[PDB]
Amino acid sequence: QPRRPGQTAREEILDAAAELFTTHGYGSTSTRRIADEVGVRQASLYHHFATKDDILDALLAGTVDEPLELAHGLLGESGPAAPRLHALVIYDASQLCAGRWNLGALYLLPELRTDRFAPFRRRRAELRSAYRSLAAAVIAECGGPPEADDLPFRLVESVINSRSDDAVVPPEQPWVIGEGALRVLGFDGDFAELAAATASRLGVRPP
């Protein structure tokens, strides 16, 4: 009887670890409890993830790899920055809000401060740095405040906090973040237009 139907045995572990790490804690959750939750022998688990840190690593990479693939594409594009940054913010905030578990909450684990997790830190810093380039262009284009260029990234990551506080997360929260991310940079163009352009770039419905 799986946690979710159709889950691979790898996906079941990742799903169980995600629930336990986010709701009980990382250092607190043993690999024995994970294995218990998915109904496998502890020893069999190691053949999918040899260590607990390997489970965390996969969970964390899954929160950044796709956002980063988009961000990298977007930095290579020509044309106006605003829609590009906007597209990124929608995609990335949508994935953090839509995640079954609030994995981003683990970013602040002190375990991530160790050399073991330097590669993840690097990849998350590269996402931050792609946000910042796009935002700096938005700012220069709109004559905005130059020192706001970290803030769109912080607005996107703020959904992690809102998830932690709130049971629900209101319907179209990514778009709400989308708008704020651009207002902080001095953008005051037409937001329904911007929204419609992003929705079709991303293949999703606008508000």
Place this chain on the structure above:
Amino acid sequence: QTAREEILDAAAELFTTHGYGSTSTRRIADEVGVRQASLYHHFATKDDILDALLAGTVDEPLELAHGLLGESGPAAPRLHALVIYDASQLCAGRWNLGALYLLPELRTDRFAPFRRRRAELRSAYRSLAAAVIAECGGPPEADDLPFRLVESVINSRSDDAVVPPEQPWVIGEGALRVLGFDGDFAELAAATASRLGVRPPGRAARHHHHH
């Protein structure tokens, strides 16, 4: 530093850099150099230590927020002043205590009271921000974002060795832009500098402040 303050400082370090569940009262007592049993007469449980640490991150901002809600006059300068004060206090910690807000331990009945307090801070922000929105014809849906921008300093501290002293002010400007405020940020900075008894960045804000 009192006996009590040394314990709090030692625990803030271990909780934020080693972990909460992972840090024993024995480790804390060892880090300060007192017997574990002496520690209990300041804080009977580890949870009591965490409670005092968490409360020191919200009590004074909440005193400020409560007073500001009682004032008449424009909402924007009031919210601005709260954001600077609060973001500054979160930046000024020796240790990044706001990083502990996401601990699953905080979801227990044991920490309901702290949860309710922080939620009142949040609610105060949203009230001030909903009034800035009404006054400037901004986006009604943005009213949680100034709170979230202030709390983002916790994430900045985690990522960065050096958080610049201008960071609260940067946050202050953003928290107002997301609400549709397009007024005069030098004037605004200078008013808040004044209200708070501090110097702002601006330059023209510093001249406006000296007025």
